[model samples]
Target chain A: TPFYSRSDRIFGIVNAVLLGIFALCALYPIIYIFSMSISSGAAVTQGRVFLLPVDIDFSAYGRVLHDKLFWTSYANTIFYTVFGVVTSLIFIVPGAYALSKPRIRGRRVFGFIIAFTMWFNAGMIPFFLNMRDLGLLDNRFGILIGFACNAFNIILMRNYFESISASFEEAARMDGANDLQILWKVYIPLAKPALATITLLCAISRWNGYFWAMVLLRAEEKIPLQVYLKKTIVDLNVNEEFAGALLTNSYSMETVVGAIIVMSIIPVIIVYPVVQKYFTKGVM
Target chain B: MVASVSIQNVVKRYDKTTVVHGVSLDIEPGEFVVLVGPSGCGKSTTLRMVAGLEEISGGTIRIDGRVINDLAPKDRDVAMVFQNYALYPHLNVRDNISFGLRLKRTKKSVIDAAVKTAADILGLQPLLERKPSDLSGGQRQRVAMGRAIVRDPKVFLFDQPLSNLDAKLRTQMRAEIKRLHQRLGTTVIYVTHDQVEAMTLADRIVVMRDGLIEQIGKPMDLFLHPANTFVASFIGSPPMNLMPARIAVDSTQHVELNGGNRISLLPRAGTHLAPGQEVVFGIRPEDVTLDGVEGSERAQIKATVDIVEPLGSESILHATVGDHSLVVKVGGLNEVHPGDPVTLHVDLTRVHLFDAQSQASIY
Candidate 1:
């Protein structure tokens, strides 16, 4: 049933080759980072480690695992990320469902108001002052609530909800399901892909979050792993005395930083595959 | 357990456009009422309003003498089978049919018994474990029907449910729906564009056009004595052959067809028509047949046959009567070819006359 001409075959081959190169380009950095994380500390420091581990060593991991601040920051990141995604979902599900209804009065104006915030946001000074006024400064709650309700996610989810046939809602209504019941029984079950995609996106964004945690969380123990890693990397690059002390701490700073980077990203790497199935499921 | 439904001057408007003008009807308990019309004719809108799926813009709808205009669909206790079947793809047939009872928190044994009964009624026992996507069109339609029947509501609303099926399956489902209504004794409000479905399934059919009802009557009555030209043409297959004519002032009995033969109007036919008034004269295809079968040779009209559609039991002759087209349903044995001169017997007793200005039938 499938027929391809010589020119079509040639174009298909060239297209596939280009796509393969594009995939490799995107994948090389992660591979290089993994290799550097397990390579000998001196080999990493000397910039010899590229895509392969020269001398295999677990010393960097051992040191990163023993760092007290790393574990605390890791735990803090987990707590903040979990709470953030949960709160975000609480705000999103009902909000998107409501906005998807054509008869909901002022829905368009409300969506426009939400979209307007994406273009213009409170500057850093006003945000800090506002957080201080609310007594969220120096609190982990501040970091947990930083990006709770994202407009993009709300719009994405709303679009997904709108794409579902209106007849399903009508059928559910006829079946004695109210708005809340329908959302739970019909819409939610049908929106698994979108839910998975939005959850992963929000989770990863919160996982790699450092800017808000650094600004709003003043306590050292409340800092997330990303902020701690950022501080260590900044010190190693810009400050000489801190770099000298870190280098003398039984492992080279470069490989230890590599191991910390990998550690911080490991949760996402583990989680991505679990949620990847929904991405394909939801779209199709 | 069935309930009577009454829609009094119901209106539905979207923005500035009125899709369904104020219309009213009373459906008896256990009655099967079919709303039949072309698309955008407000038939489905009226059906949805009765099911509480669409909000009534004006007036009131009542079920069992209780006003249900403001009640939700579930509160109104109506179950609907949608045109597309609308079965949940993720759910198996059992869960789908059992979904409403589950939502109501019905007892486990009660739900099980109800689901089993519905499955038995619809012949869906073997397919209950399969998802909707795994079923055929007819099977899916049955599942949709099964879901509605399990609810055991006061009324059943079907919105062109057989439209999605193939021709043969449509006829089969049509019979199944009729059988279901007969067994369950539930009031049914079915909306369809097919006049045949309406005629076969409805105890009373409501014909609509452009958001207004044209007529409401029994299938036989509508066929025999249509209220207007639209109903006359819409209710019959091959439709009624209508021709423009002028009532003769000289005789007060004969009507003159435009570019056609003069035909005597039966004394019972043109009683209400004024002499010298313009009118539309119509005759059913079945009424226009071969000469000498039931009428004299003088009653026959000579016409050149254009085409012959031989449909086993009967053949439809498309012929030109005078300058206008006339379709005749005759026995299949009347073998005729295109351009052949065929004399068609016009039954003057079965003719219909309508006011040309108003389209209302004269008798």
Candidate 2:
């Protein structure tokens, strides 16, 4: 065993205890929600279900799986996540590469214009009006194209490109490679970590987005899972029949909400670990 | 194909700062020329200009009587081996060697033949499928050279190509480069800061300092007859020892050392010496002897050894003569130690004198 002084032992014990408490604080909410999602309504009302299920029930998940609108919303979310991430990368990669080069004319002016959007922006009313003027309101292309290029993602990618050695480009140029060839053959392969990080950022934001989809989109077929879950909660509260039925049913409104939240988060939980490897390497 | 290169009154300027002053030189076809100096001497910049990587600011550079001031690097028909190798990490050895030919849309069979020839020359056939990261430093250097040779360019430029290797590897690679040059017989312009490399590799050496050409001559010519003090000190290892002295008033062929010692000078055919003229006395470490003096042409000076560094075949003695320190090269078998008093016999015929103000050699 390694030797330690009194102060060092005390410090280690205190650090471990504090970290354990913080981990519990972060994990408890998810555990409570999952347990409540599968418990009897009477058990939850009587505060019997705290850390685990009091009486096992699967009726809440059954209702969610049987709904046709739930399936439609889940499919719409997947469509937005895939195509939105693709469009964002297509715009960000080349734009960031051009901005990273010092030889580009008026580079400072172009970079400032892009960064200026981050510092200040027009009001939401003007943004909506611009969307309407561009014929993007109530359009599926609006969700994918309107939010594709943002200052933060572009700046992150540009900084990464700038970190690559200039010698690679010079060597390619001496070998008769043009700018496009150099970027496609040399730079893109070298920037896989940064690209992965940007892809994960865009996918997460697209997956959880609801405000613009709810405001700009009116077609029920085009609504994502988050907006559908919101509609379900608000509609159930106003329905007197459902409220009366909840008193005798095994599953409550809260349990149904928890089931939808857990289901919607499943894709992110599955994708996070794969992308986290590159995320940890890229951020440093 | 080989071609002669001519640089006429070339100058390089960046905004308000001028680095390479007006310089001119004519390189013969199939000749190996090396530009050597310390850091910030503009040797690399001049080579870059010839490769068409940097824009010419003032003058013309011609390859085979054709001006190439505005041509791009790819159009210049020259290949460069950089100090860092710059091999593409994502490419296999075969792909890296044939990258330029593929870009030029060469036929598949021709590119394969060229790559195979270069690989055979550099002994890289077995490693063709491996990436650059898997290769050793010397292997990576050979891959870089193979890439350059497969193009069959008009001229080859080396920018301190062996500086990144260890001492033993550098020596090995130095011989390999000389052998490659002899086999190819192409016009070559190489740059380095090491005098040993310049001496062993260059057919004609161009010594530079402060962005100006100091001297241009063969290796032995510069070693024996340097044009200025800078050239004399920079072109030799255990550099030529220089000391300030004054001409003796009584004798035209003698100079007075600082510590009241008089040294005789050799007589040249048509040169005149003035009395009390300030001059710099120079002598190489190898020119001084520890053996017994047999002729009247040698001058004897007393010295005390300060330190001795022994190589297997020879030893370098750091000694003090009066107020001046001198380094002496002697036989390894000679028994010498610190604080030992010794006599140095310098040959007068090999002595050098320079004008103190101009630093120019006085013949």
Candidate 3:
């Protein structure tokens, strides 16, 4: 066993206690919300639940699972997440690869122009107007294409590509590989970690996308889960039918909201661990 | 399928600063030529230009008598092994060696046979399924060579391919490369900073310095008759001992060292030296001895040993003779220590004289 000085022991104990407190602070909301989502409406309204369910109930989850608009929005969100990630990667990978090469003409100018967008952007009204002028409003392709390329993501990927040695490209060239072959066979294989990180970033952003979707998407069928969730939360406060239904039910608007929130994050929770290994490496 | 390479008046410039200035060389087919120089000497740059990896700012490089200045690297039909091996880390030995053939869309059976043949030559058959990361440094080097040989390129370019290996591995790989060249008989242009590799492996050595060719000749010719002071010191191990001296005639023509020691100069077929002309005197470490040979005119200089480095077969004596430092190589059995006073016998026939102003050999 290793021996520790008094100061070291104190530091160790204090550090562990502080970190434990922080972990509890971060974890408490998830547990509390979950507990409320399964608790009876009366117990939640009476403030009888804090950490666990007072009277276990499944009505909130049942109601959410049966809603037609909820299913549509869920499907729509998946479509956006899957296609949005694909669109972003299609643009980002080739763009970053080209920018990373020193032989690309006007490379410095192109790099500066891309990076300039990260420092400044037109106001929200102008951007919305520009999107309108581009005829992307109420269009599915608009959601997929409007925010396909992000400057920060492109810069991150370009930096990673630049970190790979130029000798690989030269060797491939000598081996009779053209530019596409070099990028596909050599650079892409070497950049898997960066690709995974970028993919995850695009997926998360697309999953949680709301502000633009809400503003641009006027069709009720086109709204993603977050937009639908926002509408439901607002409706719970003013809709008389929902208030009347809550009086006799085992669930309330708060439980429904909690349930939706938990369901929305389940995919992210499942996916994050799978890609966490590459995440730490890619960002560095 | 070997080819001759001719480089004419090649110049490489980055912005306003020129790195290689009007350098030219001709390499015959089946010849193993090593371009040896110190860092920033443009030897590797010259080799890269021939490989078509770097664009030639000014020059025409002809391969097999055809100008290839505008050709792509692959179109030039040359293969190169880089300093870092350049083996794809994602690939196994088999894939790496057959990469070029596969890129050319060669038949699968042909690629398999070629990969097998290259693996057999490099003794890499057992490691064919292993990735580059799984192999040792020497194994990786062999794989790089295999990749080059599998293509049967007209010319082979090596850019210090053995530099990353350990000393023993380097020696082993050096001999392997020589054996490979002999068996294949492909024209090879190799670049390195080590003179020993040049001496051992090259059919002809091109010594370079400061972006210019100092001398180009057989290794023995470079050792026996260097064209200038740079080649003199750069070619030999423990380098030649050089000292400032002036020509003096006292009863006979001789050179007077700065410390007032006089060494008689031997008459050559075409030599003329005037008294009081400043020159740099050079003598190889092996040329100085403790005893003079029979029938050989020698000059004696008194010196004190400053350091002794012992190798298994020989030893190097770092000695000082009256304000001038001299290195002497002798048999290992000699009992010499620092601060020991000794007399050095320099063979007059082996001495070299260079014009002080031009730094060119006078004799």
**TM-score of each predicted structure versus truth:** 0.85, 0.90, 0.91
lDDT of 2 by residue, B55-171 (tens): 899989989967889888898888988888678888899998888888757554577778778989999878989999799899999999998898898889898999988899999
Per residue, candidate 1 scores C-alpha lDDT tens digits across A1-284 of 46579878888889999999999999998888788878876777775877888786667788777789999999988998799899889889788999898888779699999899999988889988888888898887676675688899999899889988888999988876778878987798888777877888888888888787788887899888888888876666635754675566545677777788888778878887887655665273
Q: lDDT tens string, model 3, A1-284?
A: 57579878898889999999999999999899788888877778876888998887767887778778888999998999999999999999989999999887779899989899988998899999999999999988999999999999999899899998889989988877778778988899889988887998999899889999999999989998999988886565546866777777769788888787778778877887886655665344
Which is better, 2 or 3, measured by TM-score?
A: 3
Model 3 - which docking category?
medium
Which residue ranges in model 3 land beyond 4 Å of their true spot?
A1-9, A233-238, A280-284, B104-109, B248-252, B258-262, B290-298, B322-324, B333-335
Chain A TM value for model 3: 0.94
Worst 10 residues of 1 chain A by lDDT: A275-284
Q: How accurate is candidate 2 locally (lDDT)?
A: 0.85
Q: Which of the predicted structures, 2 or 3, would earn the higher DockQ when compared with the native?
A: 3
* Model 2 alpha-carbon miss at residue B241, Å: 2.5
Off by over 4 Å in 1: A1-10, A41-50, A166-176, A238-252, A282-284, B12-19, B53-57, B70-77, B84-116, B127-137, B146-151, B242-277, B288-296, B300-349
Instruction: Please tell me which predicted candidate would have the highest DockQ against the true structure.
Output: 3
Taken over the whole model, the C-alpha lDDT of each candidate is 0.83, 0.85, 0.86
Better of 1 and 3 by DockQ: 3
| Model 3 chain B poorest 10 in a row by lDDT | B290-299
DockQ of each: 0.56, 0.64, 0.73
CAPRI grade, predicted model 1: medium
The CAPRI quality class of candidate 2 comes to medium
The per-residue C-alpha lDDT of model 1 at residue A180 equals: 87
Worst 10 residues of 2 chain B by lDDT: B291-300
